[PDB]
């Protein structure tokens, strides 16, 4: 051991097949008696709102963190003339589904108030890019499975047919022990003929936003609150829930569906409340981790396609405090796909392919500026990305065997960079991962539309998550942001117990 | 719209002030202090639309 250079320290370890001794301590697991579940049916449901005001039973009972709602719903489709006709059922075996996750992207915003100081998030634009980012297969087959859950991986729906991974097919045709497509999801079909379809069922969507958690891994739920209450609002259009394929819409048209309408019934939330036992007392006041994520967004006028490139920058913003990490992507814009609804039902979620990204932290200018688009995909996947290289940088050749038909190129749906803000952006001496303040940000990024048809005006999105303390003591909910002092950040002694990998484990 | 487009001129604008002079008997202090408020507007425009 003390053979080489600077000598080391010796330790020995027993192989797994044999200890055979070590100190084996019997461990009685105990948690409070009486864990019970309630179904709080929403008071004051509407067509543009849902409001669930529910009160904790005792205020001495901890409230478990996973929460979800269920909405019974009803849609009627009908055929437009022309395109007409028309001779196939208005709903098609392989060309039709819910968008994922349905009752989510449809909702404009969600805000739950605890204790009650409100913590709210933006669910329409935030989520579709938040989904890719932290889930392993283990998770996407667990909790995440209650709502349609298969993300759009073709640049255009029309192309997909008929692949083995067409994002909206029947259950049969997803290989054993894997994530099914979104035409897997169960619901009654009361009618289905040409000129008319009409469907019914019930969809379970879990709530996102902290401190309610959509990871499987759990942590001590919020006690000792005195009243909590959720509040959705859905943006007007509501044709966004459904999905479709161009492959059937063909003509000078136009298409088969336009138009159709939805209807909800009594939704209800599902809360859960353990009780701790009279032996072990939980503290009068108690502190929780708390994250806020809020998106900043430019819109441009320039129109680029069907596969031509260009460059863009986004108006400066001044963060109050360093986000713990931020995401950046260029998605196809909102101003379109909110007109003449056929567009709403037949445009996938996917983002444009990135060529390079240079950004500026406070005053720096040109950060990362010389890192290859390949070299952007290295992190994450180190912050947990989860899509093969070919998916990022989305493009894929796939050629045809005859004389003479030119090979066909498909967009494979683009990428979204996430850069953890101290992990690989670097911060001036004596500046933590979240201290006030305040530093400009500006993202200058060149992009390319890889979707074969058609042109698209884009927008840029940048979603930054901040890390604040939140102390819920009944019945106040103070929430200090930028918790560490600038003097405390120098000479805060390092530890060798905690592993950094265990901190990136706690989402987030 | 019918209206487009007009042209506006001005002439010779004049201000009016009122100057009092206090009684010779009663004296005014050589150094006075008034309250003074200062207004200043900060603006951030974001370029998104909603309708």
DSSP string, A120-166: EE-TTTSHHHHSTTT--HHHHTTGGGSS------SSSHHHHTT-SS-
Residues 6 or more apart whose Cβ sits within 8 Å of residue A44: A51
> Cis bond leading into A260, ω under 30°?
no
The Cα angle at residue A185 between residues A180 and A187, in degrees rounded to 5: 165
B48 touches chain A (CB under 8 A): yes
Lookup: tokens for A408: 């066909």
Burial of A336 (0-12, 13-18, 19+ CB in 10 A): middle
Burial A192-213 (b: 16+ CB within 10 A, else e): eeeeebbbeeebebbbbbbbbb
Cα separation values, B20 from A360, B23, B26, B28, Å = 60, 10, 14, 13
Sign of CA dihedral A102, A107, A113, A117: positive
C-alpha span between A335 and A337 (Å, rounded): 7
Q: Which residue, among B44, B48, B49, would best test binding to A if mutated, counting the most A CBs under 10 Å from its CB?
A: B48
Sign of CA dihedral A96, A110, A123, A346: positive
C-alpha span between A278 and A228 (Å, rounded): 25
C-alpha span between A8 and A5 (Å, rounded): 9
C-alpha span between A283 and A289 (Å, rounded): 16
Sign of CA dihedral A161, A164, A168, A173: positive
Instruction: Name the strand (E) or helix (H) holding A454.
Output: none
CA A175 to chain centre: 25
A237 touches chain B (CB under 8 A): no
Residue from A267, A212, A225 nearest A42 by CA: A267
Helices and strands per DSSP (H, E), number in chain B: 0, 0
This structure was determined by: cryo-EM
Phi, psi torsion values for A248, nearest 5 degrees? -110, -10
Contact at 8 Å (CB) between A241 and A262?
Answer: yes
Q: Which residues of B touch A333 (CB under 8 A)?
A: none
Lookup: tokens for A233: 């609002």
Contact at 8 Å (CB) between A213 and A66?
Answer: yes
Residue from A277, A244, A279, A284 nearest A260 by CA: A244
Residue from A290, A289, A211, A282 nearest A59 by CA: A282
C-alpha span between A206 and A145 (Å, rounded): 10
B48/A315 CB distance under 8 A: no
Burial A285-297 (b: 16+ CB within 10 A, else e): eeebebbbbebbb
Residue from A94, A201, A104 nearest A144 by CA: A104
Contact at 8 Å (CB) between A349 and A333?
Answer: no
Phi, psi torsion values for A492, nearest 5 degrees? -90, 100
CA A77 to chain centre: 29
At which residue do the structure tokens 């991962």 appear?
A433
Cα separation values, A311 from A330, A354, A462, Å = 11, 10, 16
B47/A315 CB distance under 8 A: yes
Cα separation values, A41 from A119, A209, A443, Å = 22, 21, 44
A299/B46 CB distance under 8 A: no
C-alpha span between A324 and A433 (Å, rounded): 6
Residue from A129, A97, A30, A156 nearest A464 by CA: A129
In A190-277, alpha helices (H):
none
Beta bridge partners of A456: A304
In angstroms and rounded to an integer, the radius of gyration of the C-alpha atoms of chain A is 26
Instruction: Name the strand (E) or helix (H) holding A374.
Output: helix A373-376
CA A156 to chain centre: 21
A299/B49 CB distance under 8 A: yes
Burial of B44 (0-12, 13-18, 19+ CB in 10 A): exposed
C-alpha span between A339 and A333 (Å, rounded): 12
A440 touches chain B (CB under 8 A): no
Cα separation values, A452 from A286, A411, A414, A473, Å = 55, 7, 13, 56
In angstroms and rounded to an integer, the radius of gyration of the C-alpha atoms of chain B is 25
At which residue do the structure tokens 């050629």 appear?
A399
The Cα angle at residue A238 between residues A232 and A240, in degrees rounded to 5: 110
DSSP three-state, residue A74? strand
DSSP state of A180: -
B47/A335 CB distance under 8 A: no
Half-sphere exposure of A396 (CA within 13 A, CB side): 18
Residue from A196, A171, A175, A172 nearest A184 by CA: A171
Cα separation values, A104 from A98, A100, A125, A149, A240, Å = 11, 8, 10, 11, 10
Contact at 8 Å (CB) between A287 and A469?
Answer: yes
Helices and strands per DSSP (H, E), number in chain A: 8, 22
Cα separation values, A329 from A298, A351, A412, Å = 11, 7, 16
Residues 6 or more apart whose Cβ sits within 8 Å of residue A263: A47, A73, A74, A75
């Amino acid at each position: 051991m003390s053979n080489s250079a600077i000598p080391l320290n010796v330790v020995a370890v027993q192989e797994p097949r044999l200890e055979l001794n070590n100190e084996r301590t019997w461990v009685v697991v105990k948690g409070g008696q009486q864990v019970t579940y309630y179904p709080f049916p929403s008071t004051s449901f509407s067509s543009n709102q849902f409001n669930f005001i529910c009160n904790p039973p005792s205020a001495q009972t901890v409230l478990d963190r996973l929460v979800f709602i269920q909405v019974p719903y009803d849609i009627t489709f009908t055929a437009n003339p022309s395109h007409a006709g028309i001779t196939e059922n208005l709903l098609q075996p392989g060309r039709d589904a819910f968008r994922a996750f349905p009752i989510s992207s449809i909702t404009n915003t969600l805000n739950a108030t605890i204790n009650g100081f409100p913590v709210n998030i933006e669910l329409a634009q935030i989520i579709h890019a938040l989904s890719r980012y932290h889930t392993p297969l283990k998770v996407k087959n667990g909790w995440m499975s209650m709502q349609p859950s298969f993300e759009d991986n073709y640049q255009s729906y029309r192309d997909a047919d008929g692949a083995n991974n067409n994002p909206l097919g029947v259950f049969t045709s997803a290989a054993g022990l894997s994530e099914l497509p979104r035409g897997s999801y169960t619901m009654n079909v009361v009618t289905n003929t040409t000129t008319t379809a009409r469907i019914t069922g019930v969809l379970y969507e879990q709530v996102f936003l902290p401190p309610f958690l959509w990871d499987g891994e759990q942590a001590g739920g919020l006690a000792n609150l005195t009243s909590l209450t959720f509040n959705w609002v859905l943006n007007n259009n509501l044709a966004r829930i459904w999905s479709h394929s161009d492959i059937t819409n063909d003509v000078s048209g136009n298409s088969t569906i336009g138009s159709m309408n939805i209807s909800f019934q009594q939704p209800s939330m599902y809360l859960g409340f353990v009780t701790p036992r009279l032996n072990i007392p939980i503290p009068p006041r108690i502190t929780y981790p708390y994250f806020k994520l809020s998106r900043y967004t430019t819109q441009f006028q320039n129109t680029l396609a069907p596969n031509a490139s260009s460059t863009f920058k986004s108006n400066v913003v001044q963060l109050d405090s360093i986000p713990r990490k931020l995401y950046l992507f260029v998605k196809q814009s909102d101003n379109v796909i909110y007109q003449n609804l056929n567009n709403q039902i037949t445009t996938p979620d996917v983002f444009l392919q990135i060529n390079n990204l240079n950004l500026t932290w406070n005053n720096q200018q040109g950060i990362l500026s010389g890192a290859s688009s390949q070299n952007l995909y290295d992190f994450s996947v180190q912050n947990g990305y989860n899509k093969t290289w070919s998916e990022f940088n989305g493009v894929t050749q796939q050629f045809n065997g005859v004389s003479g038909q030119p090979t066909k190129v498909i967009g494979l749906e683009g990428g979204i960079v996430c850069l953890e803000l101290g992990k690989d952006v670097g911060l001036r001496d004596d500046e933590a991962e979240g201290v006030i303040g305040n530093f400009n940000l500006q993202v200058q990024m060149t992009v390319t539309n890889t979707n074969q048809y058609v042109t698209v005006t884009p927008d840029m999105y940048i979603v930054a998550v901040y890390d604040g303390t939140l102390v819920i003591s009944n019945t106040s909910a103070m929430a200090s942001i930028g918790v560490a002092s600038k003097e405390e950040v120098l000479n805060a002694r390092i530890t060798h117990g905690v592993s950094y990998n265990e901190l990136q484990r706690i989402y987030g």
